[PDB]
């Protein structure tokens, strides 16, 4: 999560990510 | 002509930035016309005397 | 003023009509039936089959 | 034995009482702003300290009724500029210290209502020290918690449909902070400028708990209502109806991982680890 | 070439109604030279305090 | 914290954090 | 971490410009 | 984390041509 | 993380004026 | 790791790191 003068400059890719394999 | 009579109250904006926008700003404009015989000078008084 | 009538029914009711997720109607044939008898334009007391205005 | 903390009329003593040997109180003193040269031609770096410093006090403690527990809660949400006072029973300390909420934390003030204990609420506070006279503001924004004399279950409405949540294994804990809140560095003097600001604070309510019958009509009244709907600008009423004294908020689950069902071998019945309800806009 | 301000340095001005004086306003120091028209761009404008 | 060509673009911000709420 | 383009030149245009207004224009 | 700025001045350059584009040249 | 626009811009220019340059003006 | 529109921005400096001091 990253700000320039408040304002996010991440992209709203809507990706889903979802918990990694146990092991 | 036109008001947007929803608005924006305290608790519906989330961001704002708010500039004043003066790096631009010049206080006497000179003007040639007339094939470049004739001049007018266009003079912001307060600016001048403000700074 | 006020009077409740209490086994009165209406018909047909969901979600897109005035109602709550869980107060839809059931799609039951008497109610199928009935609302097939409407062929006026407005509001209006249905007829008996006589013509005779029913809610007398 | 108590640590009193108090903003003018409000006021409100914390036991430092803890078991055996666990940590009651937690003073933390940082350089923030110093800058260590990361390069230079020297084995050691050149350094300059310019700024102020860093105190953060964290406060474990026990509190033996639920009125005082929301007090709490309220005394640490609440936007004033009428400075917070922590008063620390111990000899390396001042009289008074002047505080912020963590600087920077969604998780200021924790609470846990845990399961088999009455009349004892488990307290962790996390305070950053401030200059008494650099309280700067505007805004006054008065932190109520809705509070009702009910024993009803809580419950969970969402799109006229309500769940009540299995009494049984049940846990609350209640997260409150202030994040949006600017602590920042001054000059030539030891403790940082606390910038109030009547702005989005951080309330949370985590639920735990075991779901023994009616199972799949409890959790899918749940997951179809609150889950596989979309809310809009609503979202879900939770209502604690009388519960530690708690009515009701407006609520929504928010992020990745907010509710999780858990099946484990050999158990004829659910775990629900957490249930996460972030409190929504309600206050007028 | 007006007989009274040819030659003359300029400092002020102001909107008039005949003898009164509706508005006035200072001027960045200019001599109006010989052959030099001098105009006006002056601005009134009504609004509220909100 | 991060860099292009050896300089900081990270902004120094003078703004605390500090930790949170044990639990 | 992916980063929106049109974001970030929209965030800096503030500052690109900035070297060429402190000379004029 | 070290960014390359050749990487991000050629990425964004179409973001950075494009309210020119909007307003003609 | 809080990214200072002002450097972001400063540090990029010398490949922002790149591709110009390499083009004459 | 970043990208901006699938291509990465962070520079492949050949630069090691290698895990520290066990304590
Ligand atoms: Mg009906």
Redesign the interface.
């Known amino acids: 999560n990253a700000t320039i003068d408040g304002r996010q400059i991440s992209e709203s890719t809507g990706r889903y990510r979802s918990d990694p394999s146990r092991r | 002509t036109v008001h947007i009579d929803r608005g924006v109250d305290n ?1 519906q904006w ?2 704002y ?1 708010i500039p004043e926008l003066g ?2 700003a010049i206080n006497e404009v000179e003007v040639w016309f007339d094939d470049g015989e004739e001049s007018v000078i ?2 912001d ?2 600016d ?2 403000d700074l | 003023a006020d009077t409740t009538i209490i086994d009165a029914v209406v018909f047909p009711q969901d979600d897109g009509t005035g109602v709550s997720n869980g107060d839809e109607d059931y799609d039951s044939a008497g109610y199928l039936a009935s609302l097939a008898r409407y062929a006026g334009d407005g509001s209006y007391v249905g007829g008996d089959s006589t013509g005779s205005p029913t809610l007398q | 034995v108590d640590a009193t903390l108090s903003r003018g009329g409000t006021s409100v003593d914390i036991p430092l009482v803890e078991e055996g040997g666990e940590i009651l109180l937690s003073s933390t003193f940082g350089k923030p702003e110093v800058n260590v040269r990361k390069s230079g031609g020297s084995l050691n770096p050149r350094v300059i300290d310019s700024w102020s410093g860093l105190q953060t006090f964290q406060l474990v403690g026990k509190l033996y009724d639920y009125s005082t527990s929301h007090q709490l809660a309220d005394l640490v949400k609440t936007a004033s500029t009428t400075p917070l006072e922590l008063q620390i029973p111990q000899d390396a300390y001042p009289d008074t210290v002047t505080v912020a909420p963590a600087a920077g934390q969604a998780s200021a003030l924790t609470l846990e209502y845990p399961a088999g204990r009455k009349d004892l609420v488990d307290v962790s506070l996390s305070l950053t020290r401030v200059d008494p006279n650099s309280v700067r503001g505007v805004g006054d924004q008065q932190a109520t918690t809705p509070t009702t004399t009910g024993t009803g279950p809580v419950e969970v409405t969402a799109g006229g449909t309500t769940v009540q949540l299995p009494s049984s294994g049940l846990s609350v804990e209640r997260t409150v902070g202030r994040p949006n809140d600017a602590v920042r560095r001054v000059p030539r003097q030891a403790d940082p400028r606390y910038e109030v600001k009547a702005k989005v604070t951080n309330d949370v309510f985590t639920f735990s708990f075991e779901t023994l019958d009616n199972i799949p009509a409890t959790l899918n009244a749940l997951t179809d209502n609150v889950f596989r709907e979309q809310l809009g600008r609503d979202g879900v009423t939770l209502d604690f109806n009388g519960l530690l004294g708690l009515g009701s908020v407006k609520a929504i689950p928010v992020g990745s991982s907010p509710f999780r069902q858990v099946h484990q071998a050999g158990r004829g019945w659910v775990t629900v680890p957490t249930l996460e309800f972030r409190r929504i806009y309600s206050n007028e | 070439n007006t007989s009274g301000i040819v030659g003359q340095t300029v400092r002020e001005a102001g909107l008039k109604s005949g003898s009164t004086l509706l508005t006035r306003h200072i001027l960045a120091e200019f001599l109006l030279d010989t052959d030099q028209r001098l105009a006006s761009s002056e601005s009134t404008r009504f609004t509220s305090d909100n």
């Open positions: 608790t989330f961001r930035d790096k631009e266009v003079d008084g307060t001048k005397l």
